[PDB]
Write a protein that binds this DNA or RNA. Structure first.
Lengths: 223, 194
DNA sequence: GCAGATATCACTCAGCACGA
DNA sequence: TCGTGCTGAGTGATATCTGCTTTGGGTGGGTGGGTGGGTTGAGGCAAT
């Protein structure tokens, strides 16, 4: 038994491009890793389980041309409906031609190609090594929740569940709220708390996280 | 490798029917016979199977019958002793209580260490024996199950096995009417009493 | 040049009979 | 009653001697080297 890409990313972030081109075996076995951080194989001679505690980042593009928002998301790529549900955050990025937008995009890429730094001077980009140090320090910390924020989270989950009671008509509503969504909200709130380096998660973190789950479906399902 | 234990399968639907055909003999004869490349011998596979499956669609639709929603050949579903159906209905109170229960992580229960000893002792020493009262009403229960109509002899054997198993829990050497009543109660309420 | 299996030769010891 | 010179016998150390490869196979390697050689065919199983 030889491990694949996922196992090499244990205790790290695996990095996948062209997520559409997976075969049937990976299409079915990626569910194991996403749900339970382990790969289990019981083939001819090997009946062991591979330990892979790796978060997954994936991307995909239409094979021929551009996306068609009118058509369902599953109508342009081969990924099954079940797979897209497990992802905590799902983003649909669109490229709509427009003179104003392309002007600034070209100017920014151009300033980078000229001087290798940002055009805007409102903020100074953070140094790479310092940012990595901050990320390590944040990942060291371990926050906790409380009843006060728990009430807010449960009320928000109730509202989300009720909302999906009407959205079930659309066949592309694989983002239908489920307890997994509640756990994802908790996870994002804890992430925001970690960035603050604090130990007690406050209402601010949970409200921010709920915005990132909202803006990731609304803007990428309605458009 | 699970001889005497309990095998666990996660994605039963996402399995080619070529491999599923192996389980036909395991659940029926509790043995596997291999004859190929000069090896002709049988290996005991006296193990219990615990499998799970997901609906064809994103969820379970109550309207269509069971044989359509879950996939799997209709005959295979009959082999299983019990076939449960758990669905995540949407409610203003069930969801509230579930959310309050899965968020506390951030009504006493026996310690697992003692529970394992309990089950081991029950599995080793006790050996229930059916009584006449059990048979008198087991015939009735099986014939009633078949009358309302899927229901085959495997269901009666499942009732026998479940009645014997429940008696094991209470450490009794005789299976009483109450235990078989509980077994039949469990069977009707698994598929669910529409 | 080096280790191992083998056979060769030389030296020294316990018994023996006689003479003191 | 007894003391000692001559003899056969048996080890100890030492002299010559053969041998110093050896061997089919990958948990003996390739800084040991090809003038030391290694030349299948059916059946089972994963991928698909």
């Amino acid at each position: 038994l030889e491990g694949g890409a996922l196992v090499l990313a244990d205790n790290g972030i695996c990095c996948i491009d062209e997520f559409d081109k997976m075969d049937e075996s990976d299409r079915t076995a990626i569910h194991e890793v996403m749900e339970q951080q382990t790969i289990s194989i019981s083939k001819a001679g090997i009946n062991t389980t591979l330990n892979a505690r790796t978060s997954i980042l994936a991307a995909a593009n239409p094979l021929y041309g551009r996306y068609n928002p009118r058509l369902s998301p599953l109508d342009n790529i081969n990924l099954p409906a079940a797979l897209l549900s497990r992802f905590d955050i799902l983003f649909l990025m669109l490229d709509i031609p427009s003179r104003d937008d392309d002007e600034k995009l070209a100017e920014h890429v151009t300033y980078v190609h000229m001087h290798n730094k940002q055009p805007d001077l409102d903020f100074t980009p953070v140094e790479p090594s310092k940012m990595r140090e901050y990320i390590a320090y944040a990942k060291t910390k371990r926050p906790v929740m409380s009843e006060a924020v728990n009430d807010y989270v449960v009320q928000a989950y109730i509202r989300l569940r009720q909302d999906s009671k009407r959205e079930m008509d659309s066949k592309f509503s694989f983002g239908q709220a489920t307890p997994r969504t509640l756990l994802g909200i908790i996870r994002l709130s804890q992430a925001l708390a970690k960035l603050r380096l604090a130990d007690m998660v406050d209402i601010d973190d949970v409200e921010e996280a709920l915005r990132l789950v909202r803006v990731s479906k609304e803007s990428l399902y309605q458009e | 490798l699970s001889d005497g234990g309990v095998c666990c399968i996660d994605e039963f639907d996402k399995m080619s029917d070529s491999t599923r055909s192996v389980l036909h003999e395991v659940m029926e004869q509790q043995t596997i016979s291999i004859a190929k490349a000069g090896i002709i011998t049988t290996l005991n596979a006296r193990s219990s199977i615990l499998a799970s499956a997901n609906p064809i669609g994103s969820r379970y639709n109550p309207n269509l019958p069971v044989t359509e929603n879950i996939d799997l050949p209709p005959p295979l579903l009959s082999r299983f002793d019990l076939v449960y159906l758990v669905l995540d209905k949407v409610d203003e109170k069930n969801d509230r209580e579930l959310a309050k229960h899965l968020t506390n992580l951030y009504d006493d229960v026996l310690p697992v260490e003692f529970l394992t000893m309990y089950i081991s002792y029950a599995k080793e020493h006790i050996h229930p024996i059916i009584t006449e009262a059990a048979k008198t009403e087991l015939v009735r229960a099986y014939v009633g199950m078949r009358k309302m109509g899927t229901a085959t002899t495997r269901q009666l054997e499942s009732m026998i096995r479940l009645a014997e198993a429940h008696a094991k829990m209470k450490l009794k050497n005789v299976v009483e009417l109450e235990d078989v009543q509980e077994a039949v109660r469990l069977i009707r309420s698994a598929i669910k009493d529409y």
